[PDB]
Design an enzyme around this catalytic site. Structure first.
Site, PDB file in Angstrom:
ATOM      1  N   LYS A  79      40.917  58.054  31.592  1.00 31.94           N
ATOM      2  CA  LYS A  79      39.627  57.347  31.737  1.00 31.94           C
ATOM      3  C   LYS A  79      38.918  57.755  33.030  1.00 31.94           C
ATOM      4  CE  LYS A  79      41.401  53.230  29.465  1.00 31.94           C
ATOM      5  NZ  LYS A  79      42.830  52.916  29.702  1.00 31.94           N
TER       6      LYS A  79
ATOM      7  N   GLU B 140      41.506  47.113  36.316  1.00 30.77           N
ATOM      8  CA  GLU B 140      42.398  46.537  37.327  1.00 30.77           C
ATOM      9  C   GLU B 140      43.770  47.210  37.293  1.00 30.77           C
ATOM     10  OE1 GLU B 140      42.704  42.335  36.602  1.00 30.77           O
ATOM     11  OE2 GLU B 140      40.940  41.847  37.836  1.00 30.77           O
TER      12      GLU B 140
ATOM     13  N   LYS C 269      37.918  53.211  25.867  1.00 33.82           N
ATOM     14  CA  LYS C 269      39.306  53.618  26.067  1.00 33.82           C
ATOM     15  C   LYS C 269      39.456  55.126  26.239  1.00 33.82           C
ATOM     16  CE  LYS C 269      40.633  49.376  25.856  1.00 33.82           C
ATOM     17  NZ  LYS C 269      41.532  48.554  26.767  1.00 33.82           N
TER      18      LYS C 269
HETATM   19  C1  LIG Z   1      38.501  42.910  35.781  1.00 28.58           C
HETATM   20  C2  LIG Z   1      38.860  43.638  34.495  1.00 28.58           C
HETATM   21  C3  LIG Z   1      39.919  44.565  34.477  1.00 28.58           C
HETATM   22  C4  LIG Z   1      40.297  45.220  33.308  1.00 28.58           C
HETATM   23  N1  LIG Z   1      41.259  46.176  33.374  1.00 28.58           N
HETATM   24  C5  LIG Z   1      41.411  47.026  32.309  1.00 28.58           C
HETATM   25  C6  LIG Z   1      42.306  48.090  32.413  1.00 28.58           C
HETATM   26  O1  LIG Z   1      42.981  48.252  33.456  1.00 28.58           O
HETATM   27  N2  LIG Z   1      42.472  48.919  31.341  1.00 28.58           N
HETATM   28  C7  LIG Z   1      41.746  48.742  30.211  1.00 28.58           C
HETATM   29  O2  LIG Z   1      41.893  49.526  29.234  1.00 28.58           O
HETATM   30  N3  LIG Z   1      40.856  47.721  30.102  1.00 28.58           N
HETATM   31  C8  LIG Z   1      40.671  46.852  31.136  1.00 28.58           C
HETATM   32  N4  LIG Z   1      39.830  45.788  31.004  1.00 28.58           N
HETATM   33  C9  LIG Z   1      39.006  45.575  29.800  1.00 28.58           C
HETATM   34  C10 LIG Z   1      39.361  44.222  29.132  1.00 28.58           C
HETATM   35  O3  LIG Z   1      40.562  44.312  28.357  1.00 28.58           O
HETATM   36  C11 LIG Z   1      38.197  43.788  28.248  1.00 28.58           C
HETATM   37  O4  LIG Z   1      37.082  43.499  29.096  1.00 28.58           O
HETATM   38  C12 LIG Z   1      38.482  42.617  27.297  1.00 28.58           C
HETATM   39  O5  LIG Z   1      39.533  42.917  26.357  1.00 28.58           O
HETATM   40  C13 LIG Z   1      37.246  42.271  26.492  1.00 28.58           C
HETATM   41  O6  LIG Z   1      36.825  43.435  25.778  1.00 28.58           O
HETATM   42  P1  LIG Z   1      35.376  44.106  25.979  1.00 28.58           P
HETATM   43  O7  LIG Z   1      35.288  44.513  27.432  1.00 28.58           O
HETATM   44  O8  LIG Z   1      35.367  45.282  24.974  1.00 28.58           O
HETATM   45  O9  LIG Z   1      34.303  43.116  25.573  1.00 28.58           O
HETATM   46  C14 LIG Z   1      39.571  45.008  32.145  1.00 28.58           C
HETATM   47  C15 LIG Z   1      38.469  44.122  32.176  1.00 28.58           C
HETATM   48  C16 LIG Z   1      38.140  43.424  33.340  1.00 28.58           C
HETATM   49  C17 LIG Z   1      36.983  42.450  33.293  1.00 28.58           C
END
Ligand SMILES: Cc1cc2nc3c(=O)[nH]c(=O)nc-3n(C[C@H](O)[C@H](O)[C@H](O)COP(=O)(O)O)c2cc1C
Ligand SMILES: Cc1cc2nc3c(=O)[nH]c(=O)nc-3n(C[C@H](O)[C@H](O)[C@H](O)COP(=O)(O)O)c2cc1C
Lengths: 216, 217
Positions: free
Chosen positions: B74, B165, B14
């Site tokens: 970020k 995303e 984050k």
């Molecule tokens: C395609 C995709 C888009 C995501 N978009 C964001 C985002 O825009 N901002 C963010 O803080 N996290 C984003 N995430 C992170 C997800 O919230 C996260 O993968 C999920 O909560 C599981 O946590 P982890 O990645 O710590 O295992 C995204 C994850 C994926 C796979």
């Protein structure tokens, strides 16, 4: 060394049916499926893991017609994973996800949980209410899962092949997926290649970075 | 494991520490990961923008606007930021490029083998374009598969990252003139090292249990 893994992995064209995953490996592949990231931790997926003869035969019904070139892979691998996406994103699922995050200790306060739920529904609504692309959005997350999975199983020392060459209507019907709210997207046989795997000895090929990659 | 540990310990960062840059070696390695992802028919329907200069990262960060403003830091603070783009259409020139590269790399023993490969690829391509009407989505799916490969890969290199995303793809596309070049942006992935401001580094990971998501047969 993950770069070595990425460079040395390949799509397996023939498996040795006698070479099974170890009990440990069989659990580790499930761990990989579960722990993939996804947008908003939406996890919009279901997995079928076929490890019996009967199970694999059922999956291999899908390798019909134009797709017979994929039948033996589904039959001969130790384990076969069917990656499925939800067909629609519903509020019950969204509540399921946030409640699980709460049980796991991700929220210090009721306010933090509520803000997480609001943030998730912003994205879910964008897709299901405005863009009307929630089925695609969810399918994308399942493909991300597949990509994670293929590298992971390679790193475990296991062979695999991703398969789009199958009849999803046949597979969905065989496992009653539609009524359950899912549809099959990718089939991934996992195991060990045989000497008949022509692709184990061929050079890997990719387009050059001077076409695909810009540095700024 | 050597990889299960990685999967269980990785997280979506984050906040990044801007002072901690990728080594030249790491910067090469992330490019290797992007290039060597698999894809349906080896179609490789993708383009990558790797932003490592402050000015480059700033251009990418322009897309984090409106509802997405708290994804900007970020994109600026990470060492390297990768924009994953899909082709908007699968042209014959691209299909020929792919099979000719496979031939250059020695994958075909005969002209007949090459022709059979080209025919099989064109079969799948035509099915998506003409019958399923989902060729854009089909290509996007390959790009997402690349992203999944990439997230695990960088984690295994001991690098932090976050998939994003939450950005305006129209703004990003315009900034880099992608539409005219035949591409559109899908996912942005900052890569580097997390800072103390990364609240997600210390939280437990959460997933649905397998009794819900997984059936054994
Ligand atoms: C395609 C995709 C888009 C995501 N978009 C964001 C985002 O825009 N901002 C963010 O803080 N996290 C984003 N995430 C992170 C997800 O919230 C996260 O993968 C999920 O909560 C599981 O946590 P982890 O990645 O710590 O295992 C995204 C994850 C994926 C796979
Ligand atoms: C989504 C997807 C679907 C694919 N479908 C099949 C398939 O049905 N049958 C097959 O033999 N290979 C299939 N492949 C394997 C690709 O041809 C392969 O990934 C590509 O040629 C790159 O070679 P590599 O995987 O050995 O690096 C598929 C790959 C992906 C990523």
């Amino acid at each position: 060394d993950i770069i070595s893994v990425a460079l040395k992995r390949h799509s397996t064209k023939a498996f040795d049916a006698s070479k099974k995953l170890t009990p440990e490996q069989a659990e580790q592949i499930k761990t990989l499926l579960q722990y993939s990231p996804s947008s908003t931790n939406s996890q919009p997926w279901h997995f079928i893991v076929a490890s019996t003869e009967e199970g694999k035969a059922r999956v291999a019904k899908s390798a019909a017609g134009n797709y017979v070139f994929n039948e033996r892979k589904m039959l001969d691998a130790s384990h076969v994973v069917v990656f499925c996406a939800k067909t629609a994103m519903d509020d019950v699922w969204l509540k399921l996800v946030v409640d699980q995050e709460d049980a796991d200790g991700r929220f210090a306060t009721p306010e933090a949980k509520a803000a997480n739920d609001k943030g998730r529904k912003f994205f879910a609504d964008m897709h299901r209410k405005d863009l009307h692309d929630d089925a695609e959005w969810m399918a994308k997350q399942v493909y991300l899962n597949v990509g994670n999975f293929l590298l992971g199983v390679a790193a475990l020392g296991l062979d695999a092949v991703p398969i789009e060459g199958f009849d999803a209507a046949i597979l969905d019907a065989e496992f009653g997926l539609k009524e359950k709210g899912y549809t099959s997207l990718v089939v991934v046989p996992v195991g060990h290649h045989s000497v008949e795997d022509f692709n184990a000895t061929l050079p890997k090929s990719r387009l050059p970075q001077n076409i695909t990659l810009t540095e700024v």
